[PDB]
């Protein structure tokens, strides 16, 4: 929601793209299909993996035998001990619950950002050589075969090359 792409102007996900988190669907004279963008996907995988390992590995735990034994004339200290365990119980329960709720919202936003950036990176390349037809799609004003497509995917797109043909179909 935060960046408007996921479940926003791009209304739904693709079960057909099964090799990445973010990618493209193309349709040209030669054919069509799905292709995950490997750069952005691996970067996300690396970073989300770093996130999980951080939430996990930062928990340095001391060696502790929690349990204690008190006799019938030691109820005050038995109750102090209970207060200690119950105090840590509430502290860890509340913080873990909120950590999860808060990091989850951040994780989704992160993905939404990644998609938004990917879309606007393509849009910046194509400029006026294609039209933004919505739902995360561009419709080219020129013919864009496989090599043309693949060059848009991996940043090496040649705008001036198709400039001429583009201006025509407008």
């Amino acid at each position: 929601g935060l960046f408007g792409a996921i479940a926003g102007f791009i209304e739904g996900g693709w079960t057909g793209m099964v090799d990445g988190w973010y990618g493209y669907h193309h349709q040209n004279e030669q054919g069509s299909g799905y292709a995950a963008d490997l750069k952005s996907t691996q970067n996300a995988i690396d970073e989300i993996t770093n996130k999980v390992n951080s939430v996990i590995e930062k928990m340095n735990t001391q060696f502790t035998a929690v349990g204690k034994e008190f006799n019938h004339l030691e109820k005050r200290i038995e109750n102090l001990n209970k207060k200690v365990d119950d105090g840590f119980l509430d502290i860890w329960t509340y913080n873990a619950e909120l950590l999860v709720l808060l990091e989850n919202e951040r994780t989704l936003d992160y993905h939404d950002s990644n998609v938004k950036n990917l879309y606007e990176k393509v849009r910046s390349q194509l400029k006026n050589n294609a039209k933004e037809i919505g739902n995360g799609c561009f419709e080219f004003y020129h013919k864009c075969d496989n090599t043309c497509m693949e060059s848009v995917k991996n940043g090496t797109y040649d705008y001036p090359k198709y400039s001429e043909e583009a201006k025509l179909n407008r």
Partner: protein, 321 residues
């Protein structure tokens, strides 16, 4: 007519959901659980060292050598919830919880005969000290680690006996003080009537006098026997003196105490497994930060929480539509 390139994101058949601060039950493509909720239902070795399991006995019964009850080290102690009475002859076990705590984890532990039965007590009877309160196989008996000394041939001379600790580690010494129900019992066992016991090390010192009285019968005893212990530092000396009523050490225990762990009271079975976190219900393989198995744990454990689910989204919102 145009060719098209669309930008989009992954979806799948995943049914995992997560909660966020803004919305509940969000289906996501991938997730991981931060909460450990599974255990192996076994009591295992901690730090690669097995716990001491006391069978059907408790620490008192084990350490005193109750007739009804080989590990030179252990990481924690296990007692079953319905363990038998340790003390058979009724009485108070002084600083009992402290002793248990201090025995919870040791390395190096060796039972040795501190006061050999054959040569230590030429002037007292070290055989007749048995009782209906500590039966064994239909016969009156007694703790194996103590000797209930009684008079020999109508006399009980003053006894004086010392041990110097040359074990190079702490020596645990246990003894008892007997308080007969009547004067007759006092004289029948110890002859003397008015008696005392003294026990002192360089650090410990206490004098005891019998407190003759008829208390409620427990295992047929109207009298009482109190149990005491102390830890003698390496190279130190402990002395016993008495004109009666002294249940003397026979076996003592050289031990090195670890920072300590705890005592797990549970019927969960001990197994030859390894763990870093032990629970009375079973062991947990600590990877995750949190755990809802059991608040009482021993080792390097995840923190206990009252949570039912701590699901962390890794992937994105799943929208297969």
């Amino acid at each position: 007519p145009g060719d098209t390139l669309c930008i989009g994101y992954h979806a799948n058949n995943s049914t995992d959901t997560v909660d966020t601060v803004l919305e509940k039950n969000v289906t996501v493509t991938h997730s991981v659980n931060l909460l450990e909720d599974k255990h192996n239902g076994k009591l295992c070795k901690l730090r690669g060292v097995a716990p001491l399991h006391l069978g059907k006995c408790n620490i008192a019964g084990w350490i005193l050598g109750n007739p009804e009850c080989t590990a030179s080290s252990w990481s924690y102690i296990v007692e079953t919830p319905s363990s038998d009475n340790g003390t058979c002859y009724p009485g108070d076990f002084i600083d009992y919880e402290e002793l248990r705590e201090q025995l919870s984890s040791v390395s190096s532990f060796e039972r040795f005969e501190i006061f050999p039965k054959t040569s230590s007590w030429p002037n007292h009877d070290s055989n007749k000290g048995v009782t209906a309160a500590c039966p064994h196989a239909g016969a009156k008996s007694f703790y194996k680690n103590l000797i209930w000394l009684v008079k020999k041939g109508n006399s009980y001379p003053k006894l004086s006996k010392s041990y110097i600790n040359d074990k190079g580690k702490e020596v645990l010494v246990l003894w008892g003080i007997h308080h007969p129900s009547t004067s007759a019992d006092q004289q029948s066992l110890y002859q003397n009537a008015d008696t005392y016991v003294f026990v002192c090390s360089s650090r410990y010192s206490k004098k005891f006098k019998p407190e003759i009285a008829i208390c409620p019968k427990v295992r047929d005893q109207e009298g009482r026997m109190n149990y005491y212990w102390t830890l003698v530092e390496p190279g130190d000396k402990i002395t016993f003196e008495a004109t009666g009523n002294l249940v003397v050490p026979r076996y003592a225990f050289a031990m090195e105490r670890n920072a300590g762990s705890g005592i797990i009271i549970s019927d969960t079975p001990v197994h030859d497994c390894n763990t870093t976190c032990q629970t009375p219900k079973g062991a947990i393989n600590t990877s995750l930060p949190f755990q809802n198995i059991h608040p009482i744990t021993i080792g390097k454990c995840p923190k206990y929480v009252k949570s039912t689910k701590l699901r962390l989204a890794t992937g994105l919102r799943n929208i297969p539509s």
